[PDB]
Structure 1
Amino acid sequence: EWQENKSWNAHFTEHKSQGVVVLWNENKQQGFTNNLKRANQAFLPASTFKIPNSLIALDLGVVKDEHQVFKWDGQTRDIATWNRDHNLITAMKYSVVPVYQEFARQIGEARMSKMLHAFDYGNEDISGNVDSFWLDGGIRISATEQISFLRKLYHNKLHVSERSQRIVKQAMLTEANGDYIIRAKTGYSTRIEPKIGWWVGWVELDDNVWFFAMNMDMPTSDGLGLRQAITKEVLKQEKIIP
């Protein structure tokens, strides 16, 4: 169940932006969003797919652990932080697509599909290239479906080892201080219209957890910081964070 709260639209409008934030209060089992229809609109996950891809790679032993080093392939790419060696922690942090494309190739289509059905991940459709389907293939997931997935991960309820789930949650770590912890992943779907930015994850408090999933129209990269900025304004409006 999602209650609509259109007052959050002011934070989009303020920033000349259009999109949706979806929040889920774990203790109360209640959801909230500014736009019910867009909350259920499915889009390409793009880099947010690094969450399930990580889980599958670890569960299958494609990735041994979070210290294993994936050597740069020597190809210079546009994002400078990609042109160096990575481990799982840094490949998540810097959203290093070619590292995850190598995982996908090794996982292979059969296991990939089986896993995404186990996860109930969006439309469970991996059609397209095994190495890019989540960037330009047939898979789609909505913000509310992201939340349903993330809740399973939070509770170690996905059909992969507990260990895999704990390592991915570690790798998702974004921010922590004395008030909250955020575990999350950004994304930016550019290859297929509409261009959209994602931020999905959760906020751990002492006594509750708030799951979130947002997406917004993103015609250029110059708005990418608004993913987190708008989300955090919403969280502050709702007194989830100071």
Structure 2
Amino acid sequence: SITENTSWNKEFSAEAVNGVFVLCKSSSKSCATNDLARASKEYLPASTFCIPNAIIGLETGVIKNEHQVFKWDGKPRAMKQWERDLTLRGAIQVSAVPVFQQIAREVGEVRMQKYLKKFSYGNQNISGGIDKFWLEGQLRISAVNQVEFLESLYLNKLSASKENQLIVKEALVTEAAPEYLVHSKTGFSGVGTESNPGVAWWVGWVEKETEVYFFAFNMDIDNESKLPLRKSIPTKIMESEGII
């Protein structure tokens, strides 16, 4: 069940952004959103994919453990912040595509397909190349599906060891206050064009007091300068709901 909250629209109008935000208290039974249609519309996950990719890496033993260091070979990578040795959290935090690309090759198509089917992860379409299907391929997932997936990870109810789920959850912490903890992950596919814009994501959950909130945001983006709105619009919405 998803309900439309009219007042959340103000935040998108301000910035002239087309997107959606989905927010759920306690569980994904009752969610609220600014747009019913766009909530269940599926988009390329881009780097929000790090999350199932990491779980599957651990599960398959491609990632040996919590403390493994992904060594840089010294060959050029597409961003300078990727040009260094990285732990798992480091790689998640800076969206180190090359690291996740090598994890995906090692997992292979067959296991990758099996796990996204196990995880009900979006359209579960991994075609287009094993090291790029989440970046430019045909894989697609909605804000609503993201919240369900993160809810299952929160409850240790994904098909993976509780241990591997805990390791990933800790790698995902992005903000810690006495009153609450935020785990979240960004994604950005690219600019595309004006006639066909890329998509930008922010997804995660907030543990506050004894309560938990799951969120997922995306928006059309045709200019990298618009990128901060992927955090600032949903932060505004949560700040105004007293969640952060």
TM-score (norm: length of structure 1): 0.96
Change (3 A) 1:53 1:190: same
CA contact (8 A) 2:42 2:140 kept: yes
State how far apart, in whole Å, the 2-side matches of 1:234 and 1:73 are. Answer: 42
Change (3 A) 1:140 1:170: same
- Counterparts of 1:4-153 in structure 2, within 5 Å, are 4-26=4-26, 29-153=29-153
State how far apart, in whole Å, the 2-side matches of 1:123 and 1:91 are. Answer: 25
State how far apart, in whole Å, the 1-side matches of 2:222 and 2:46 are. Answer: 15
State how far apart, in whole Å, the 1-side matches of 2:197 and 2:165 are. Answer: 31
User: Does structure 1 residue 163 correspond to structure 2 residue 163?
Assistant: yes
Q: How many Å apart are 1:74 and its aligned residue?
A: 2.2
State how far apart, in whole Å, the 1-side matches of 2:166 and 2:204 are. Answer: 14
CA contact (8 A) 2:49 2:134 kept: yes
Gaps in structure 2 of 5+ consecutive residues: none
SS at the partner of 1:133? coil
Q: How many residues align?
A: 241
Runs of 4+ residues deviating >4 angstroms = none
Q: How many Å apart are 1:73 and its aligned residue?
A: 2.9
Q: How many Å apart are 1:191 and its aligned residue?
A: 7.5
Instruction: Please point out which of 225, 228, 233 is paired with 2:231.
Output: 228
CA contact (8 A) 2:77 2:98 kept: no
1:158-207 Cα offsets, whole Å, 9 max, x none, are: 11111110011001110010221110110001286430110011011111
SS at the partner of 1:122? coil
CA contact (8 A) 2:191 2:221 kept: no
User: Does structure 1 residue 216 correspond to structure 2 residue 219?
Assistant: yes
Question: Aligned residue for 1:201?
Answer: 204
What RMSD in Å do the two structures reach over aligned CA positions? 1.4
Question: Aligned residue for 2:176?
Answer: 176
CA contact (8 A) 2:186 2:202 kept: yes
Gaps in structure 1 of 5+ consecutive residues: none
Change (3 A) 1:107 1:191: farther
Percent identity reads 49
CA contact (8 A) 1:40 1:142 kept: yes
